Symmetry: C3
Amino acid sequence: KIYTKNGDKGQTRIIGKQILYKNDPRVAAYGEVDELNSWVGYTKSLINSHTQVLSNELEEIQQLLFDCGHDLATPADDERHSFKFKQEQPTVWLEEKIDNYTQVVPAVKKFILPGGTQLASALHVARTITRRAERQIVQLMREEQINQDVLIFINRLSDYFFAAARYANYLEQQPDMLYR
Amino acid sequence: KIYTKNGDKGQTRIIGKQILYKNDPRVAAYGEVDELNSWVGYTKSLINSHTQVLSNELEEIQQLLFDCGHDLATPADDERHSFKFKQEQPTVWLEEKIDNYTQVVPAVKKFILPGGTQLASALHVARTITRRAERQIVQLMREEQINQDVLIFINRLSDYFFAAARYANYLEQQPDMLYR
Amino acid sequence: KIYTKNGDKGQTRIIGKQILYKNDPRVAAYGEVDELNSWVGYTKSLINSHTQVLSNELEEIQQLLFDCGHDLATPADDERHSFKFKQEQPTVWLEEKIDNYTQVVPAVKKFILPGGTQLASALHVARTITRRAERQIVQLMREEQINQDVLIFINRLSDYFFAAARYANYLEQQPDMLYR
Ligand SMILES: Nc1ncnc2c1ncn2[C@@H]1O[C@H](COP(=O)(O)OP(=O)(O)OP(=O)(O)O)[C@@H](O)[C@H]1O
Ligand SMILES: Nc1ncnc2c1ncn2[C@@H]1O[C@H](COP(=O)(O)OP(=O)(O)OP(=O)(O)O)[C@@H](O)[C@H]1O
Ligand SMILES: Nc1ncnc2c1ncn2[C@@H]1O[C@H](COP(=O)(O)OP(=O)(O)OP(=O)(O)O)[C@@H](O)[C@H]1O
Ligand SMILES: [K+]
Ligand SMILES: [K+]
Ligand SMILES: [K+]
Ligand SMILES: [Mg+2]
Ligand SMILES: [Mg+2]
Ligand SMILES: [Mg+2]
C-alpha cells in the first residue's frame, strides 16, 4: 500500500532519519519542486505536431527536477546521504537553449504579456511556478545549509521557460502581445 | 451583488463571528482547499471517452472538499457551528480506489515522473496541489485546534490522486516514464 | 542575454534601488500576480467559438495585472518612481461585468462546485489563484505601505472570475453543479 498513514498527524520523513512537520520550509521547498515537475508533465501533454521539437527537453527537465528535489530533501550534515546535483552541465544546457530561442524569435524591448498558444501559455505558467519554487528554496536557504547548485539551476530554469514560451509561440506563428 | 466590498481592507469573515486578515493561516488553509477544488473541476473537464469511469468520483471529491473547507473555516470553540466532516467513510472509499488502481496498473519500484496523458498529468497536478493544501492545514494545526479528520482525509487524497493518475495513463495505454 | 546570473545567490532588484531576498513578502506578492497573469493567458488560450466574447476582456485584465505588479514592486517611499494604478475605472469596469454576468445566468442560492466546461473550470482556477495572490498582498500590506488600490482591484477581480466562470458555462449551456 502506498498509504502508510504515518503522515496522518502532520509529520513526515525527509532523506535520512529526520522527521519534520509538513509545513517545514524544507518540505515546502521540495514540495514546490514536485508541483513544478507535475506542471511540466502537464505542459508536455500539450505538445502537438508544430511543437514536437520541445518534447524531449521537457522530459529531461523532469529528470533534473527529481535530482533537485532529492538534494533539497537532504540535510547538509547527513552522513549517509550526499548531494548529487551539480549545476554546471544542466545550467549550460539551459543557457544554450535560452540563447538559441532568444535569437530565433522576433526581438522585443517591451514586456510581453504571458500567453498565446496553449503550449506557450503553459510554459509561462511553468515559468511562474518555477519562480514560486525558487522563493521557497530561498526561504529554506535562509534557515539551513542547502546545495546552492539547485538554486542556480532553478533561477536559470525560469529564464528557460520564458524563452521556450516565446519559442512555442514562434513555432505556431502566434504573435506575442506586448504590455501597452 | 456578490461584491460586498467588505474585504477591500484585507479582513474577511470566517464561519461564526470572527474576522481575520486574509493571510491568516486559517484563511490560507481553506483557500488552498478551494484552489484544489477548482483544479479538480478543471481535471474533470478533461475526461474523454477512454476515461469516463473517473468522472463521477472526481465530482464526489469536490463535494467532500467543500465539507473539508467548511470545517477548516470553523473555530473549534465556536458554539453555534460544529464540525461536520468525519474521515472514516470517505477515507476508506479513497483507500478502496487506491487499492484497485494500484493493483490494476503495471507494477513499478522506481519513481515515476509525473505526466503522460493530459488527464493523468492533471491528476498529478491535483496530487501536488493537495499536498500544498496539506502543508497549509498543518500550519494552521500548529496554531489552532482543527478537525484532524480533515488532515487524515487530505493526506490520503494525494495518494488517491497518484493512484488515479497512473490509472488514467493505463486507461489510454500510455506508459508511465520512470526516473533514471 | 535574459540571464544575468545576478539572482543566483537569492537576492533580486525591485523597482528603484532596493534589493530583497526572493522570498521577501514584496517579491512573493508581485510574483503571485505574475503567476495569476500567466494563468489568465492560459485561460484565454482555451477560448472557443462559443466563448469568443470573453477573449478581449481577459487580455485587458492581463494589462491591468501588469500595472498592479508594477505598483506592488514599488516602495511607497521611492522618490524616483510613483504608483500608477488607480482602482476606480478598472474596478467599476469589473463590477459592470459582474452585474451583467450575474443577471444573465441561472439564479442559485447554493454553493456551486467549481467546474463545468474547460474554460469555466479555468476561470475558477483563476478565481482561486487571484485569491491566493490577494492573501500575499495582505501579507505585504501588514509590513509595508502599499497602493491599497491594488488590493481593492484584486479583491473585486476574484468576484469577476466567479461571475465569468458561470457565464462561460452559460455560453456552452453547461449546467453548474451545486454543493449537496
Ligand atoms: N504535504 C506534503 N508536501 C510535500 N512533501 C510531502 C508532503 N507529505 C509528505 N511529503 C514528502 O513526500 C514523501 C512522500 O509523501 P507521503 O505522502 O508518502 O508521506 P506521508 O504523508 O508522511 O505518509 P502517508 O501519506 O503514507 O501517511 C514524504 O516521505 C515526505 O518526504
Ligand atoms: N483571498 C482570500 N483567500 C481565501 N479565502 C478568502 C479570501 N477572501 C475571502 N475569503 C473567504 O471566502 C469567503 C468569500 O470571499 P469574499 O471574496 O466574498 O469575501 P470578502 O473579500 O471578505 O468580501 P468582498 O469580496 O465582498 O469584499 C469569505 O467570507 C472568507 O471566508
Ligand atoms: N523567484 C522570483 N519570484 C518572483 N519575482 C522574482 C523572482 N526572481 C526575481 N524576481 C523579480 O522579477 C524580476 C525579473 O526576474 P529575473 O529572474 O530576471 O531576476 P534575477 O533572478 O534577480 O536575475 P537573473 O535571473 O538574471 O539571475 C526581478 O528583477 C525581480 O523583481
Ligand atoms: K503515502
Ligand atoms: K465577494
Ligand atoms: K533573468
Ligand atoms: Mg532569475
Ligand atoms: Mg501523505
Ligand atoms: Mg473578496
